[PDB]
Swiss-Prot record:
Stated name of the protein: Myelin P2 protein
Written domain comment of the UniProt record: Forms a beta-barrel structure that accommodates hydrophobic ligands in its interior.
PROSITE patterns xref list: FABP
Subcellular location: Cytoplasm
Family assignment from sequence similarity: Belongs to the calycin superfamily. Fatty-acid binding protein (FABP) family.
Disease linked to the protein: Charcot-Marie-Tooth disease, demyelinating, type 1G: An autosomal dominant demyelinating form of Charcot-Marie-Tooth disease, a disorder of the peripheral nervous system, characterized by progressive weakness and atrophy, initially of the peroneal muscles and later of the distal muscles of the arms. Charcot-Marie-Tooth disease is classified in two main groups on the basis of electrophysiologic properties and histopathology: primary peripheral demyelinating neuropathies (designated CMT1 when they are dominantly inherited) and primary peripheral axonal neuropathies (CMT2).
């Protein structure tokens, strides 16, 4: 199952190439501007076999709840209506979102106490690093 080490509140401490990632996703000018300032907190929790990932910012709060390997509908912060699945692969918590024949992945791994989120769309790679607080 998902390591309990993922559970808790995570503070963004580092972000590379998030703007290009949003642009590759088709995010508009205004949401990019707000997104690059947002510096969100991510809260991962579980109730039974339902995992919840909540992202909080002064701009926008969103959350998803899911069971591993079971596809679910998601309306993303940037208003994509996606089909999403979260899987577990070698201890990495891996999310895929599909919409309009496109796909993006968000991979979350633990690295010396930090949570590292690698987000890929086409050939664009965003890395966001979080510390547990």
């Amino acid at each position: 199952g998902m390591s309990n080490k993922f559970l808790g509140t995570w503070k963004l401490v580092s972000s590379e190439n998030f703007d290009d990632y949003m642009k590759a996703l088709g995010v508009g000018l205004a949401t990019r501007k707000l997104g690059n300032l947002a510096k969100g907190t991510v809260i991962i929790s579980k109730k039974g076999d339902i995992i919840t990932i909540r992202t909080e910012s002064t701009f926008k709060n969103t959350e998803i709840s899911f069971k591993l390997g079971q596809e679910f509908e998601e309306t993303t912060a940037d208003n994509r209506k996606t089909k999403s699945i979260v899987t577990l692969q070698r201890g990495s918590l891996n999310q895929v979102q599909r919409w309009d024949g496109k796909e993006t992945t968000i991979k979350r791994k633990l690295v010396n106490g930090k949570m590292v989120a690698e987000c890929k769309m086409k050939g664009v790679v965003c890395t966001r690093i979080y510390e547990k607080v």
